[model samples]
Target: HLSDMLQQLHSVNASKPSERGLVRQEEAEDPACIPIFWVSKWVDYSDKYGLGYQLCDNSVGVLFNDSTRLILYNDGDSLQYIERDGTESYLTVSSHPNSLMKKITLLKYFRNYMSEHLLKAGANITPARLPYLRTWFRTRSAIILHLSNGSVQINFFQDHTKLILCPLMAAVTYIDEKRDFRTYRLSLLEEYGCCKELASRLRYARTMVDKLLSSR
Candidate 1:
């Protein structure tokens, strides 16, 4: 009976605009234009590094380390239903294991840093691009962008997001010419349904906005 009642609620669902407009727009998005956000181990650079493998002189937020393991361990708590029933199963239901919780405080910082990047460019993960995001954990790929006085740590999506890059671990760079608040956000908004005036409010020069428009 409850299942049938829940099904009825679907009839009242509100209408939403058809996404045909945003469909093709996303299809042609160039991954090359996407700027990467990362934490630097060393903050010294002499040139505009972008395009190929280059080191940026940007601020270093987190340091990369090989010792700290972010491996998610269930430790038995996640096995809830087998032994106990959630009479208090609201959020009181089975929760993430304590091991994961220990890592979250740092993870939140990384999320905040990349939140804007993800909004402009969706989680740019794919199956074909194995070499970029795909590699070994214990081998050449498993290096961790360990945190210290900085903030957060990324999980397995390091290469996919290219989330963290250290001086030792050289990374590909892309110069963000539109480096201002308003103009940068505007360009991103035009390309993808990114930030608007309210979110990225700042004085935008007409020349820059026009140049950004002509490129489209």
Candidate 2:
């Protein structure tokens, strides 16, 4: 089924590596900042039986985009961000501090390395490359695999780290395990109960995620 879905990727063959966003950069460089061109609009499919969807009081789709948007960022620690066509496409590990200046150096040097190694390594992404793309998309830590399209995953599991600066829901997305149910009202819970600042937007996102899940 994933192969079938990836078939859609063939439609994007016209897209080039520079436009694909394999490396990190700044808006001054490339506006899109859209990486993932190497995979050619395709990524390995994970066999998540009930891994992507979730259910609380009722079955609902845990939208990866909303979650990633709400929670994902780099606070220094030598982070990376990719710019595609003048826009940010994705980022890698690190903390939750949004900065474009710190990542400019990599954008300058990451190209030859990517082309050289990717040719030899197949689908595996190496840490020496962009956003840890050569790592086969599987974290040695065994983090959940987000196989859904339009969802990009990031992780920061090192001890002694707290996510202070959260990501905006504009350009990022996190995938939920496969399942559908609405047992919990995420927005109301996180907003009224926890008193979150972005609750207004997150609550709206929770609703969208729920609706998307129900659509499935």
Candidate 3:
């Protein structure tokens, strides 16, 4: 199945609009081009602890194995710790006591590694109080993330591709292995024959969403 999906993606890329001279003029005014929080870079240390990710707005987060989450805001000053049941507490990175010292150290390490190595993905948007990762689970092919802001992101392991569906905007954003970002209106894909790889992924994402909802 993974091989078949990769083949489908390659076929789609080969016949993409860039090669065909059928570019639509209305493409200039993209309706899906809206500002949102996007995961730009990530490091999976799940073997030891959990996943560390940096958002497009430069905020850093570490979703630990125990289901707790620590977020370092973009300003590098404060941190937000989210409990398993959605409880939240704020603390300054510099002034935090010994209770959080260990997590703070790990967060900084992840932040430094990402800053020095991984390149950012997606557009640079104005920083805000971004949504936190509510839950995540990994399948053989992809990692699915449920965000607090009612969005879901699927990161495929094979090609480093990603699909983010935002409920508020009702749009889906695709980030390819090259880190190029493209947003698509869901209705547009429904009307048009979108790429088979993406459409299939979207179906899987929707199923995941349903599972999350039912379990909640």
Candidate 4:
């Protein structure tokens, strides 16, 4: 389970007194919280999930050290690089010269190209590979319930609006039904040390998918 993995990771780190991540004693309850001093260590902990890259004069390199993923940048002998510290990190390449629709249309071109040479790399990433995505659309469009915070902020992009909501959890919960997996993932991702980018993306994605299904 993701929560188990997280707890294990924290436990492992806590035992290392030399590198005791700045976790306040009070905040390190069931759901742990690392204070500001531990952010660098947290970055290193998150980097193991995946590596992201930036395009250079030719192929390029990006690496994870103790701080963040650093990409070397060289322009006419001047060297300054880009560093990313979170998920949803982007490359330093020149933005593709096209509208959003155009970019989405051409995205599959690289996938097809990579499939032949990279040998199933692209094939594995195809939507046919993970049919679980379709199941999320079947869920209803429900109002969010804030349990941990007095108010939670969510952005709905269609009209570029943000909502600050306060919910009474005695009558409010994450889903219409009581499903542990659904609520667990949401709660885990809500933690600052976990993945804020993923949580935000998931919220927008759920809203969009629900809106589309209701329209049809």
Q: Please say which candidate is ahead in TM-score: 3 or 4.
A: 3
Q: C-alpha displacement of 103 in model 3, angstroms?
A: 0.8
Models ranked on lDDT? 3, 4, 2, 1
Model 1, 1-216: lDDT tens per residue? 212212221221111112225622233234443233333222111132111110121211211132122211123121111111212111111455564353343433433443433333222222010011111122233222222212111222223322221112121122122321111222332334422222121112122223323432
lDDT per model vs. reference: 0.23, 0.24, 0.71, 0.25
RMSD of 1: 19.9
Q: Please give the clash total of every predicted structure, in order.
A: 3, 52, 0, 0
Candidate with best TM-score: 3
Off by over 4 Å in 2: 1-99, 120-148, 151-216
Residue 205 in model 2: shift from native, Å? 26
Error of 1 at 138 (Å): 23
lDDT of 4 at 175: 17
C-alpha TM-score for every candidate: 0.20, 0.19, 0.78, 0.19
Error of 1 at 183 (Å): 23
Which tens-of-lDDT digit does each residue in 98-206 have in candidate 4? 3323322322233233334432111111110100001111123222211112223222323322222222221101211111111122222223222232234334533
Off by over 4 Å in 1: 1-66, 69-95, 113-216
Point out the worst 10-residue segment of candidate 1 by lDDT: 127-136
Question: Which clashing pairs does model 1 show?
Answer: 50-173, 106-152, 137-142
Candidate 2 TM-score over all chains jointly? 0.19
